[model samples]
Target: GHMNPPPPETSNPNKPKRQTNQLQYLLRVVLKTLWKHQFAWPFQQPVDAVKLNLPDYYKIIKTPMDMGTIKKRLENNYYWNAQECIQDFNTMFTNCYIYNKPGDDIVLMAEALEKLFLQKINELPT
Candidate 1:
C-alpha cells in the first residue's frame, strides 16, 4: 500500500545559514498581526484559528528596495520603475499560505497590487 510522504527537514547542515535582521523581524510581526486581526477567515471548517508561518517575508527583507535611491530618483523627477517592487510584492504574497499549502487568492492579491502600483506610476506627473 502507498504511504504518505515524510515531513520536510527543518534545517540542513550542508546549506549556509542565513542571518535575520531587525527590520525583517518587525515586518514579519506586523504581517502576522494583520493576518491574525484582519485577514483570518471566519467560520473555518476545522474551527481553529489560522496559523501564520511565512518564511518568504525574510527573503523580501534580505533584498529590499533601496528606498533612498527610489526617493532620490522620484525627487529628481526620474521615471519610477515598478518592476522590482512588484516582483518583491509578488514573492511575499505567493509565499503566504495556509495549512502549508498555496493559496489561490494570493495570486489575485499580487496582481491587484501590481496594477495599483502601475496605475500610480502612470499618474505621476513627470
Candidate 2:
C-alpha cells in the first residue's frame, strides 16, 4: 500500500500541496512519457458516447478508463502504489481491445501504447 505523490520532482520539492512521496514521483515520470506518445491522443480522454454516436459503448466497455483520468488520480493521490496506477493504464488499453477490432486504428494504437507503457515501467527502478 503506497500511494506516494510527486511534487513535480526536482523543481518544486518543498511545496506544501499534497503528500510528496518517491513512489508517486517516479511513477509520474513514466506517465509523462505515455502522455507524450503519439498513440496517446485517442486515450487522453474518455470516449464520447454521445459525440461519437457510439451509444452501446457503455454497455460493452462496462468501466472505461483514460489517461486524463489516471493522471488526475495520480495527482489526487488516489493510488496506494505504482502498481495500482499501472492497473488503470492496463484498463485503458484493454478497453480499446474489447470494443474495437484487432486491426482497427484505435486497437493498433492501444497495442503500441500498451507496449510502450510496459517498457517504460520496466525501465523504472526496481
Candidate 3:
C-alpha cells in the first residue's frame, strides 16, 4: 500500500494575511498610473470607449466605494484600456510574492511596487 497522508489543516486562524496588503498596494499603483496618464487619453472627442475621465479613475480605484460612482464616471469618460492596466498590475502583485526568507514574507513591498511599474509600462500607449 502506497497511500499518502492528507496534509493536516491547522487550527490557527490568525496566520498573517499578506494578500490584502498586496492587493491594496496594487490598487494604489493602478490609480496613480491612471492619474499620471489621464490627460493622454486617445480621443479628442468623446467616444463610447473613452468615456470616464482621469479624476473618476482616481476616485473609483482608491477604495471599493460605490459602483454608482464608477458607472457614472465610466459613462462620462469610459476608457476600456484602463481595465487592461489594472488587470496586469493585479496579476503581477498576486503572483510575484514568493518567500525565500525563514518564516519571513521577504519579498519586500518595494518589489511589488517595481512589478506594478513594469506592468504599467507594458500597458502604456505606444
Candidate 4:
C-alpha cells in the first residue's frame, strides 16, 4: 500500500536556532557605512535617491534603521530585488575605491568592503 507522508511539524524543540551568517554581518557593515556617508538619511528623499541612482528595490527603504520595513519586504519575498540593490552598491563602492590611491587606508577599506556585500547578496532567499 502506498501511504501519504505526514506534513512536517512546524514546531520542533530540537531545531537549531538561526544564527547570524556572513551575509547578515555584511548587510550590517554596508548599512553602517552608508549611514555614515549620509546615504541612509532619516527619510528617503527623491533627490538623494536620484543622485545615488538607487534601484527600484531601494525605493521603499527610507532609512537604514528601518528594520521593520526590510523585514516586511523580505517576508513578502522580495529578496531577489534586494540583491540588485546590493550589487549596485558594490559598483559604487568599487568606483570609489578605484578613484582613491591604492595606499590610502580608506581606499583599501572601501575596496575590501564590496566583496562581502556581493557575497551576502548572492546568498539571499531567492
Candidate 5:
C-alpha cells in the first residue's frame, strides 16, 4: 500500500509545505524497527523459543521514509543501536502527535507503536 501523501512544496511564499520526506522516513524506520523487534519477541518465550525469520524490513525500500536515512544517521552521525534508533523514532511520533493535539488518545497510534517497540526490545538477546 502507498504511504501517506507527498510532502508539500515549501518554496512558495504562502501555503508552507510539510517535511513529508523526513516524516515519511521517520515513520518507515519506526515500522521497520517495530517489525524486526516484534518478530524477535516470540523466540524469547520458553515455549516459543523457536527462531523465526523476520519479515523483509526492506519491503518498503522505495518509500520516502526508507531506513537508509536512519542507517546513514546512525553510522555517520551517531553510534545508535537498532533499539535506540527505533525508540527515538517512536518517541518522535508520539511527541509530534501530542504536540499537534493534546490528550488526543482517540487514535492512539503512537501508544500502540510504543507497546510494540517495548515488546520487541524485551525479546532482544541480552
Candidate 6:
C-alpha cells in the first residue's frame, strides 16, 4: 500500500536525533574530561592484539565497546540519550575488568578512570 510518497531532501532518509545540541553539548563536556584523562588511553580504541598477545580477545569479549567507538556513535547521533551512552561507558570499564587479570596496572587504572567517570557523570547537569 503506497501511501505518502518519500520526498527527496538530499539522498538518504531524513535523520533525527542529530540536532540535540543541548544534549550533545553536555555529553561532550563529560567526554572532554575523559578525553583529557590519562587513564583513558587503553580503553579508547578496540583491542587489536597485533603487537601484544591477545588474539582471542574478541571471543571472550563478546561485547567490546570502547571510548572511541562511543564518541563516534555519539557524534554520529547513534546514542538515543545520555543514559544509553552511560551504559556503554560502564560497559567499556566492565569489559576491561573482565578481560584483564587481577591487580593488573591496566585494570587498576581502568578502575580509577571508571570511578572518576562515574563521579563526573553523576554530577552531570542533565
- TM-score, every prediction: 0.28, 0.78, 0.22, 0.34, 0.34, 0.78
CA lDDT, every model vs. true structure: 0.33, 0.71, 0.35, 0.40, 0.39, 0.70
On lDDT, who's better, 2 or 6? 2
Candidate 5 residues 1-126, lDDT tens each?
Answer: 232334212133343334333343333543456546533332121111112221321232222232333444443433224544555445444433533355555235445656775664555443
With candidate 4 superimposed using the best TM-score fit, by how many Å does residue 22's alpha carbon deviate from the native? 16
| Residue-by-residue lDDT tens digits, candidate 6, 1-126 | 112222212222345665454357535777778877888888777666544567666667777777777777766676656777788888888888888999999999888887778777767764
lDDT of 2 by residue, 1-126 (tens): 122222222223343344445455545677888889988888887787766778678778766788877777777666656676677788888888888886899888888888888787777665
* Model 4 lDDT tens row, 15-104: 333333433533454444443443343221222334445443233332222322333333333344344345445544544444446788
Off by over 4 Å in 5: 1-87, 102-107
Summarize candidate 1's per-residue lDDT along 24-104 as a digit string, tens digits. Answer: 322233223323432233211111111334344333333322223333322333322434333433444343332224455
Count residue pairs with overlapping backbones in model 6.
0
Which pairs in model 3 have colliding backbones?
Answer: 49-78, 51-76, 51-77, 51-78, 52-77, 52-78
Evaluated with lDDT, which candidate comes out highest?
2
Task: Give the Cα-based TM-score of candidate 1 against the true structure.
Answer: 0.28
Residue pairs in collision within model 6: none
Q: What is the C-alpha RMSD of each candidate to the true structure, in Å?
A: 14.0, 8.8, 19.9, 15.7, 15.3, 10.0
List, in order, the clash count of every candidate structure.
0, 3, 6, 0, 2, 0
Kindly list the per-residue Cα lDDT of model 3 for residues 85-104, writing each as its tens digit: 35543443343232123343
